[PDB]
Each structure stands twice: as structure tokens, then as C-alpha cells.
Amino acid sequence: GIRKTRETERLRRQLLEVFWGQDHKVDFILQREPYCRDINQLSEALLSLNF
Amino acid sequence: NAADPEVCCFITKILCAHGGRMALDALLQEIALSEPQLCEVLQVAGPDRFVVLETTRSVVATTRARVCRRKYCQRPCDNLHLCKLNLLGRCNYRNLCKYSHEVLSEENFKVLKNHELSGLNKEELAVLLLQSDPFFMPEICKSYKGEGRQQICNQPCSRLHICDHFTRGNCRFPNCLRSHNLMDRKVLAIMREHGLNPDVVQNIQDICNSKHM
Ligand SMILES: [Zn+2]
Ligand SMILES: [Zn+2]
Ligand SMILES: [Zn+2]
Ligand SMILES: [Zn+2]
Ligand SMILES: [Zn+2]
């Protein structure tokens, strides 16, 4: 269920490559869905934020 | 949409990633909202989440979420469960601590969802609780009665010569002689020895001044 440190970090680095310079937003999305392992669901959740 | 909980938690998150306080101008560089849009969110969320000061507008993050003070807690209990000493950079702890070191455990995640705070990491939550939860402050001197009286107390005194009600946000009495000033030289020394730097104490002071109104 809950992600491992290496899984979270791999997902973080991948999300940061797409959403450059959005470190706080990438982490905010990773903390809101800590069980999610899908890069595409995590990317669509980030894109839903109007800020 | 100034009332959205997602945008409020994201502001709390940025403020706590930068020490619990930021100038409005510096906060704007990190969130895609115009100045009036950000101002509307801060205003409608109010002083229970954001304390705004005209120092040059400055913003201090706060919360009503509290940590459980029980030495042994028997569930149910709807507070956060975490090691207090660990957050102050002073837990000696194989880990034989009887208090949770997993800041974002399943139990704590649920409490964070109730306070609309899911999205904060363990470092940002520590900064937030340190300036909002009075459980993180050092002990108050019980023999301290007020200013210009009793030679301070019976005693340097290792405890705070501050109003207890002021720190807990409930000093609703007009005849209070006890100090509400945390930026005093002696208070800062006691706060520092217990893990609270003067920037954190100034955040606490502003939050407590906000509760006093
Ligand atoms: Zn930042
Ligand atoms: Zn408890
Ligand atoms: Zn501990
Ligand atoms: Zn004393
Ligand atoms: Zn008082």
C-alpha cells in the first residue's frame, strides 16, 4: 500500500522533469495520495489544481 | 473559489516550507494567484489558518490541530499522535520510544484530512505545530504573579514568566498583571534551550496576539 522511499523519490523525479520548478506542488500531490503508484493519475491530479 | 480547501492547504504548505512565515510578495512568486486572488483566500480562511500582519504584508501559518499529551493513550482519541521531543530535535531514540516517530502515519493522515491539511510533509507539519500547539512551549513559572511584583518569583528562573492563558489563547480577563510579551531576552533564552528560535517565537507571539482579539 504505502509507498517506499525509493518509489516516492522515483515518482518525484519523474513528476519534476515534466512540471519543472514545481517542487512544492509535486510533493503536495505525493502526500495527498500516498498509496498511488501511477505516474499518470499523479500527473492528472497535479493538473487539476487551479493555482 | 476563494473558499477552496486545496488552495488553503497549498498556502499553508509553502509558508511552512519557508519557516512558518513569508512576506506576501515572496508567497506570490510561488503560487499562481494574482495578489487580489491570494488576498481573498487569506481573508475568507481567516485568522484560524492565516495571520496577516502589516509590518510590507507578512503571513503567518497556523492551525487548530493538536498533538495528544497523554503519556499512554487508549483509543479512541481524535488528536495527532507523535513524539513531541523528536519534533524539538531532542529525542534520544533500535527505537524504544513509546510515541510515534512516523509523523505521517495512517492515524495521523486521517486527522490531517479532518483539518484539511493532507499535502504537508513531516518537516512542514513540524514547523506548523511548533508555532501553533502550545504543548511545544517550555513550562510556565507557577510562582510568577505579574509585572512589578514578588521580585519576579521565588527565584535564574528556568521557567517562563508569561501569562499561561495568553499562550493557550484564552486570556479573557481585564485585571491580568502577567506578561504577554514573548520577545523578552529571558523568554527567548528559555525558548532557545528548548528548541524554539526567535523567528518561531515571533510567529507564536503574532498568533497569540491574533487569538487575544
Ligand atoms: Zn518555496
Ligand atoms: Zn491520544
Ligand atoms: Zn521519540
Ligand atoms: Zn519563575
Ligand atoms: Zn494574561
Tell me the CATH number at B8.
1.10.10.10
**Do B176 and B131 have their domain in common?**
yes
Q: Identify whether the C-beta of residue B179 lies closer than 8 Å to the C-beta of residue B141.
A: no
Question: Cell numbers at residue A29, please?
Answer: 500531490
Question: Cell numbers at residue B197, please?
Answer: 528560535
Give the resolution in Å.
2.3
**Do B163 and B177 have their domain in common?**
yes
**Do B85 and B99 have their domain in common?**
yes
Ligand nearest the Cα atom of residue B177? 5
- Break chain A into its structural domains and give their ranges: 5-47
**Do B161 and B184 have their domain in common?**
yes
For A2-40, give one letter per residue: b (16+ CB within 10 A) or e. Answer: ebeeeebeebbeebeeeeeebebbbbbbbbbeeeeeeee
Of B65, B87, B111, which marks where a domain is finished? Answer: B65
Determination method here? Answer: X-ray
Ligand nearest the Cα atom of residue B165? 5
For B46-84, give one letter per residue: b (16+ CB within 10 A) or e. Answer: eeebbbbeeeeebbbbbbebbbbeeeeeeeeeebbbbbb
Contact A25 B10 (CB under 8 A): yes
**Do B185 and B82 have their domain in common?**
yes
**Do B180 and B83 have their domain in common?**
yes
Cβ count within 10 A of residue B187: 21
Of B13, B30, B65, which marks where a domain is finished? Answer: B65
Q: Provide the domain count of chain B.
A: 2
Minimum distance, in Å, between the CA of residue B124 and any CA atom of chain A:
11
**Do B45 and B140 have their domain in common?**
no
Residue B61's φ and ψ, nearest 5 degrees, are -85, 140
**Do B177 and B88 have their domain in common?**
yes
Rg (CA), chain B: 18
**Do B48 and B75 have their domain in common?**
no
Task: List all residues 6 or more positions away from A14 whose beta carbon is below 8 Å from its beta carbon.
Answer: A39
Name the amino acid, one letter, at B76: P
Name the amino acid, one letter, at A47: L
**Do B120 and B198 have their domain in common?**
yes
Distance B87 CA to ligand 4 centre (A): 26
Name the amino acid, one letter, at B117: L
Name the residue of chain A whose CA is nearest to B113's CA.
A32
**Do B77 and B150 have their domain in common?**
yes
Contact A31 B1 (CB under 8 A): no
Name the residue range of residue B50's domain.
3-65
Phi/psi region, residue B148 (left: phi>0; alpha: psi -120 to 50; beta: rest), is left
Question: Cell numbers at residue A15, please?
Answer: 513528476
Give B111-118's long-range contacts (Cβ < 8 A, gap of 24+).
Answer: B111/B65, B111/B78, B111/B79, B111/B80, B112/B65, B112/B80, B114/B78, B115/B63, B115/B64, B115/B65, B116/B5, B116/B8, B116/B9, B117/B9, B117/B12, B117/B63, B117/B65, B118/A31, B118/A32, B118/B9
Minimum distance, in Å, between the CA of residue A36 and any CA atom of chain B:
14
**Do B90 and B102 have their domain in common?**
yes
